[PDB]
Paper text:
Here, we report the crystal structure of hAQP10, the only human aquaglyceroporin that becomes stimulated by pH reduction, in agreement with the altered cellular conditions observed during lipolysis in human adipocytes. In contrast to other known aquaporin structures, hAQP10 displays pH-dependent glycerol-specific gating at the intracellular interface, rather than flux governed by the classical selectivity filter. Specifically, we identify H80 as a critical part for this regulation, being the pH-sensor that propagates structural rearrangements leading to the opening of hAQP10, upon double protonation associated with low pH conditions. Our combined analyses reveal that pH regulation is achieved by a cytoplasmic, glycerol-specific gate and, likely, a widened ar/R filter, both unique to hAQP10, correlating with intracellular acidification of adipocytes observed during lipolysis.
However, full-length hAQP10 yielded no crystals and we continued with a variant (hAQP10cryst) truncated in the termini (Δ1–10, Δ278–301) that crystallized at pH 6.0. The structure was determined at 2.3 Å resolution, and reveals a tetramer fold highly reminiscent of other AQPs, with each monomer formed by six transmembrane helices (TM1–TM6) establishing a conducting channel. Strikingly, the region typically linked to selectivity in AQPs, the aromatic and arginine (ar/R) selectivity filter at the non-cytosolic end of the pore, is significantly wider (2.6 Å) than in previously structurally characterized AQPs, as also found by HOLE analyses. A single glycerol molecule is instead located adjacent to the AQP archetypical, central NPA-motif (N82–A84) in hAQP10. However, toward the cytoplasm the glycerol molecule is rather positioned close to the unique F85 of loop B in hAQP10 (invariant as a valine/isoleucine in other AQPs). F85 has a side-chain configuration unfavorable for glycerol passage, forming a unique mechanistic feature. Moreover, the entire cytoplasmic pore region has adapted a tight arrangement not previously observed, achieved by the first part of loop B (G73-H80; loop layout likely allowed by the hAQP10-specific G73G74-motif) with V76-S77 capping the cytoplasmic opening, F85, and R94 (of TM3), which seemingly stabilizes loop B in the closed configuration. Notably, HOLE analysis suggests that this narrowing (0.9 Å) permits water (0.8 Å at the ar/R filter in hAQP2), but not glycerol (1.3 Å in AqpM)16 flux, in agreement with the proteopolymersome data at relatively high pH. Nevertheless, as the obtained crystal form contains the entire hAQP10 tetramer in the asymmetric unit, intermonomeric differences were analyzed. While overall highly similar, three chains display an identical, closed, cytoplasmic arrangement.
Residue numbers in the entry:
A (entry chain A): 18 to 268
B (entry chain D): 13 to 268
C (entry chain B): 18 to 269
D (entry chain C): 16 to 268
The structure:
């Protein structure tokens, strides 16, 4: 079954993406920042994307991201009827990787918290799994952040995926994508941590909702949960339109 | 039916796109470090991000063969006869405009963080100054002379490298990796000669955003600060590109 | 017959691997973290794998790791009867490279330790050579940690080596492996370092046993020493069986 | 320039000059900023970037040598005439001396601000080590000599292996990048004892600069007379490294 094969690729790639991304936050948090910090988190996040894109068969393979799946539907490369299935698989995979992360870091989490799982405050561990905005950040500014960041990402991915573009060399495309993730992380990561990917954010938030952290994962940050869902989708639409226009202006 | 037939228009669009990306990533990383109280960025993160921005922007621009992104490089391309002189004012203006616009986007991207960091007080010098998010300012100890030399050298070295990567009489680095190697050059320059004044090496990258901060809340001190520093990142890199290009060219002439 | 050349490549590669890896820990610990830290240790271990793999003739050359050698047997690329030879050579090279590190950092060890060679305290230097778990880590968590990390490394190496995949540009395979090791170190290095390699751990632990640290190197961490030996082997087996199942799933 | 030796000397001067500007530049950036613009990691990283840039400048690994130790290796394998060895070393030495003056000028204002004009070799505000290397205070001469024999021997074996057109190694056009990875690995694993000068010209030439440029004879007496270890020990490392490389090739063929 082709759909099944496509679904396997999404599940595998999102799983590896999420393990490495979340593991790097758990490493920094539960170690008191003696084995990780903000830079380590951004770098491991960009290496996670490089590796996951390889796992998924490169940029032309798995999407790993509802935002990118939307972009593929817009340009005609993925049938609209398959979009919910992809997003479902990507969400489930991120949910499952959060469980793997929880088990990988069980002793470290227990040691750091004494078993007290919190969303805010000095020992909070909710942000190992999903993102939370900086304390100063309004919903509007956060929405803008993650329209711009995701639209930049999407235009970069589409230009790499576009075979008529002379860009990066065969077999290195995931490495350059990793470079862009790093650049975005270090230049646009301060407001709310470049989730850039609604499955990357909602799947794990749901995991922490049911695995001990409770409803505050949805009320925290002024109801922040829906911004990493909606804004990347807006960013993918605007980014796909921008890219399609640029192509039209060029030939 | 939307195809741009004019070559000049296509070239201008590339300048605009590449400079815009270069400047968003470059200024964003300074803003991230500054506004976060250095908990989300720092000097190293700024130097690394600025060299990543160059790599990414040169890909966006069509590799080193495509967009210039830099009035100093555009001068070099004229000097070696690859850009008609008459197009040079057009390129520089589009570069300036793109950098100005990208500063606007940075300002909107970091509005809440700026307000929180400054309480609304937009200063150019002092513990909480934020003008250096957009344009570059010299260390307090630096004279114009030393600052001038610093930018002549940094920019001259950059241009010579770009010329060597471009020159097809050389063996060249692998196709599709030029931008990565340019990025590595930018990183090296930032860690070895970025202390005096933040290595702008690009008049558009500096003046455009300085003009933005002039009108967007920082006032005329952006032009008086540093003993009238604003003109050094304009003139010195152009002097550096001229000396670098002349140096590259006789070296080549010297081996023929 | 290429057995002797195959052994030489294992010995050379492991030796560069261990010098660079251990040196970076010694540089960090011994300088009071003024010339190294957790991050340079993880990055140095990445560079070391990249350099050692070039030295060993790239991913299809020296194995450098009992867990990869085990994977080569399972998939039928290394004869089972050579597995004990490769592991022995890998173990011996890691033991010798620890001697080289000790000599390299002789004055710095004495300055850091005043001659007191311990495992566990504030001036402990045993973890320059072999890996010890975080104080909170149970043997269960540490075992799972190594099984997962090594399994991920091995799936990555299999996919790079497998010529049915489109591949990574020729002569950059080692650089991409190094990026995986960096990713593993930053995302799952906190529990017990990322030995990922039985010879890289047991070889040097044997060295510290006889070179001055004593039997504590085997009782510390609730008898930690066997976990970096057995867990990467289980990870190699589980990763290999997973790579082969996925693959078979895409064939008839 | 019709003279072959002339063009070869020019290549050595230009390569070493860039190597030194970038290498010393990063130490001045870290020291004179009070480590707000650089630190130990930055110095190691910029050192490794300087080498790959300078090796490009020189025409890749099969171009300029940039290093008395590597030229000795080239003489031993017959790829460079012995009678040209004192010439190469002298040009490498003088390039490093000239590059140190460029560093002093580039960082003139930063140096005055940091020292108040008192140039010292030891103590809280010493600036001598911007230009040349000094050993960790705990290090004996013997241990530093071993440190530089091993570090340089490993560098030389890597470089010979890359030069050796019989080896499948790095993609054409990226050999200087992999050498720079090597220099970073060496800096992070073996840079604590005395930096990783690995290069007699990189060390002596700058030391002679600071000697005449205001730091005085103490650059030669500091570190229990340390100055000759980064001169002699890389030469022994190159010799040992070259024999080792030749042994290993023979062991395969
Ligand atoms: C664990 C660290 C590195 C693992 C790297 C795996 C690289 C090989 C992946 O190839 C792709 O796998 C997809 C499944 O996801 C399939 O759809 C298939 O088409 C194939 O082309
Ligand atoms: C799998 C899709 C289902 C996800 C739905 C989870 C969101 C449930 C709504 O939670 C509420 O969100 C408000 C913001 O609207 C917050 O103010 C807060 O009070 C919170 O209680
Ligand atoms: C990262 C943002 C940049 C995305 C821009 C996508 C534009 C695609 C350009 O296509 C190329 O345009 C040339 C003319 O310019 C043509 O001759 C032809 O070669 C065509 O294939
Ligand atoms: C993040 C890395 C992205 C790699 C590939 C992006 C570049 C692909 C298109 O580039 C170039 O767009 C220029 C406009 O800027 C045009 O002039 C056009 O001729 C085109 O060729
Ligand atoms: C780190 C950035 C430094 C700038 C890179 C310089 C690019 C010039 C590439 O051309 C050639 O690369 C060849 C490899 O084959 C070498 O032989 C060398 O002769 C040179 O002619
Ligand atoms: C429209 C593009 C040009 C941008 C701004 C033009 C120059 C602004 C000049 O400002 C003045 O420059 C003097 C010279 O350094 C300083 O001493 C100080 O008096 C400053 O107030
Ligand atoms: C920092 C480095 C910048 C200086 C650039 C020096 C360029 C040297 C001139 O080119 C060289 O001319 C040789 C003979 O004319 C050719 O055989 C070929 O080798 C070519 O590469
Ligand atoms: C700084 C790293 C530079 C490395 C440049 C290339 C290294 C070449 C390694 O050669 C390999 O040596 C193996 C012995 O270990 C042998 O098995 C042999 O087959 C050979 O292929
Ligand atoms: C203590 C365990 C640590 C290393 C693992 C040892 C693996 C032993 C495998 O033996 C081999 O099994 C093959 C298939 O099972 C058989 O074909 C046969 O060739 C036999 O020789
Ligand atoms: C489950 C997938 C198993 C795939 C394992 C087989 C890997 C193929 C080995 O590669 C080959 O190794 C040679 C040396 O042995 C090299 O010289 C080169 O020719 C290379 O192509
Ligand atoms: C740091 C990440 C390390 C993982 C490297 C993963 C294996 C790379 C093998 O080559 C890749 O094979 C894929 C499967 O065919 C293709 O999709 C193609 O794009 C190609 O590049
Ligand atoms: C050259 C390598 C030799 C192989 C090393 C394996 C021997 C390890 C045994 O440790 C023993 O653990 C005891 C705990 O009961 C200690 O009290 C003491 O008896 C010690 O001897
Ligand atoms: C060639 C491999 C030989 C290595 C043998 C190591 C000796 C075994 C370690 O001794 C004991 O292990 C116990 C449980 O593991 C610990 O609780 C502790 O009491 C320790 O002293
Ligand atoms: C920061 C500046 C980066 C410039 C990189 C320049 C790389 C091109 C240098 O090519 C080589 O120049 C040698 C002179 O040194 C000559 O011998 C000649 O044979 C040529 O092949
Ligand atoms: C630090 C690296 C150690 C150097 C080891 C080099 C000796 C191996 C030489 O033979 C290797 O094998 C084949 C011929 O033997 C070819 O592939 C050849 O080009 C080389 O690869
Ligand atoms: C080719 C140029 C050679 C440069 C070196 C020549 C000067 C030697 C330095 O003099 C003395 O060296 C003694 C030997 O260690 C030290 O004890 C120390 O007191 C120092 O004063």
């Amino acid at each position: 079954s082709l759909l099944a094969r496509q679904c396997l690729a999404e599940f595998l790639g999102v799983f590896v993406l999420m393990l490495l991304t979340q593991g790097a936050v758990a490493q920094a948090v539960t170690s008191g920042e003696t084995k990780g910090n903000f830079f380590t988190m951004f770098l491991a996040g960009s290496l996670a994307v490089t590796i996951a894109i390889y796992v998924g068969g490169n940029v032309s393979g798995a999407h790993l991201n509802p935002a990118f799946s939307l972009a593929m539907c817009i340009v005609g490369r993925l049938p609209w009827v398959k979009l919910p299935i992809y997003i479902l698989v990507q969400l489930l995979s991120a949910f499952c990787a959060s469980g793997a992360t929880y088990v990988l870091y069980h002793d470290a989490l227990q040691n750091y918290t004494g078993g007290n799982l919190t969303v805010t405050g000095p020992k909070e561990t909710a942000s190992i799994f999903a993102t939370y905005p900086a304390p100063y950040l309004s919903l509007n500014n956060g929405f803008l952040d993650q329209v711009l960041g995701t639209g930049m990402l999407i235009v970069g991915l589409l230009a790499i995926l576009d075979r008529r573009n002379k860009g990066v060399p065969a077999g290195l495309e995931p490495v350059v994508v990793g470079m862009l993730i790093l650049a975005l992380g270090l230049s646009m990561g301060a407001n709310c941590g470049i989730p850039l990917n609604p499955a990357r954010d909602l799947g794990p938030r749901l995991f922490t909702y049911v695995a001990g952290w409770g409803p505050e994962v949805f009320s925290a940050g002024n109801g922040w949960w829906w911004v990493p869902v909606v804004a990347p989708l807006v960013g993918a639409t605007v980014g796909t339109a921008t890219y399609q226009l640029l192509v039209a202006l060029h030939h």
